[PDB]
């Protein structure tokens, strides 16, 4: 369920370090190690996560209803020295 995106400088660059919903903390940040996932909506889990190269929470209005917001949990495909921020991205923030 991963999507290639590469904060929003339209260019997108959200690098892993040694509008915001949460964070990913871990080492290899893949299925070979336990990683910590913190997401607000708070849900905090430690699992054998296989994270996306560009993990995020997609945000859109359900059928263009401004009173009904929905999101896509594009963070990992399966379920500390490095971390990255999980952003809330509207499609319009990435398109021309």
């Amino acid at each position, epitope marked *: *369920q991963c*999507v290639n*995106l590469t904060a929003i400088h339209k260019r997108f660059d959200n690098p892993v370090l040694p509008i915001i919903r949460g964070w990913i903390f871990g080492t290899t940040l893949d299925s070979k190690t336990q990683s910590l996932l913190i997401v607000n909506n708070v849900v905090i889990k430690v699992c054998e996560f296989q994270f996306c190269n560009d993990p995020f929470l*997609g945000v859109y*209005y359900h*059928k*263009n209803n401004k009173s009904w917001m929905e999101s*896509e949990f594009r963070v990992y495909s399966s379920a500390i020295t490095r971390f990255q921020t999980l952003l809330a991205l509207h499609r319009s923030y990435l398109t021309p």
Partner: antibody, heavy 121, light 100 residues
Framework: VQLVESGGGVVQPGRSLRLSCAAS????????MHWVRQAPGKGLEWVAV????????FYADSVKGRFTISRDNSKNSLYLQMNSLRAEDTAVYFC?????????????????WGQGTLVTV | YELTQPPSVSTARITCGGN??????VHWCQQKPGQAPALVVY???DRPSGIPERFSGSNSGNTATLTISRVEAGDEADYYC???????????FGGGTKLT
């Protein structure tokens, strides 16, 4: 807005075939594109979609790992490389222009369809 | 995810069932014999330019409907129901309903 498929024909099982679609009448680089196939006597079956910048490629479960979708914005053209074709892959292949789906973050429906090209395996 | 719709319909109403389909946008395309499909309805009830006001629709509960009023002989085509499945990033098509 027009789409023209080519590269169809007759092949044997186990062999590959590359299809292409020429786009004109619109800015190709601003739209995502779909491939859809229709076996004789059957309904429409989705094959793959590619984003306008070529960064994201999604495939139907039945073709994933065998078919590759790609685009060339400079040449205003769409390609589909089909490897290891089987008898079950006999169908008319269409290229089509994607349209944003309001119920999904980056989902698409299909707006403009080409005439399609027949591939027999 | 899959859609379910009848092989054919003789105002014509074409139904498209699914699991809580209300939460998904339903789109419809019309394919005439010997011709490519064309978009008729999108986002449940919106029409693209060129489509007659005769074409309308709705989406509620576990079913969606394409309603074609004042049906003409020129409408004798295979109408397909499709949605985007965000769970697998696939376009899901129904069997297709033929009008007569």
């Amino acid at each position: 807005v027009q789409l023209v498929e080519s590269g169809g024909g007759v092949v044997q099982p186990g062999r590959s075939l590359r299809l292409s679609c020429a786009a004109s009448g619109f800015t190709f680089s601003n739209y995502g594109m779909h491939w859809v196939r229709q076996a004789p006597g059957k309904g429409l079956e989705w094959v793959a979609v590619i984003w306008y910048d070529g960064s994201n490629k999604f495939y139907a479960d039945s073709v994933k790992g065998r078919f590759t979708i790609s685009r060339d914005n400079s040449k205003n053209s769409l390609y589909l490389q089909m490897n290891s074709l089987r008898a079950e892959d006999t169908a008319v292949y269409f290229c089509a222009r994607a349209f944003p789906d309001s119920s999904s973050w980056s989902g698409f429906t299909i707006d403009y369809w080409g005439q399609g090209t027949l591939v027999t395996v | 995810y899959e859609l379910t719709q009848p092989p054919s319909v003789s105002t014509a109403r074409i139904t498209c069932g699914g699991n809580n389909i209300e939460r998904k946008s339903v789109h419809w395309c019309q394919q005439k014999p010997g011709q490519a499909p064309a978009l008729v309805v999108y986002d449940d009830s919106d029409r693209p330019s060129g489509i007659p006001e005769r074409f309308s629709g709705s989406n509620s509960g576990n079913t969606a409907t394409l309603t074609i009023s004042r049906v003409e002989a020129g409408d004798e085509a295979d109408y397909y129901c499709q949605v985007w499945d965000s769970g697998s990033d696939q376009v899901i098509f129904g069997g297709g309903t033929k009008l007569t």
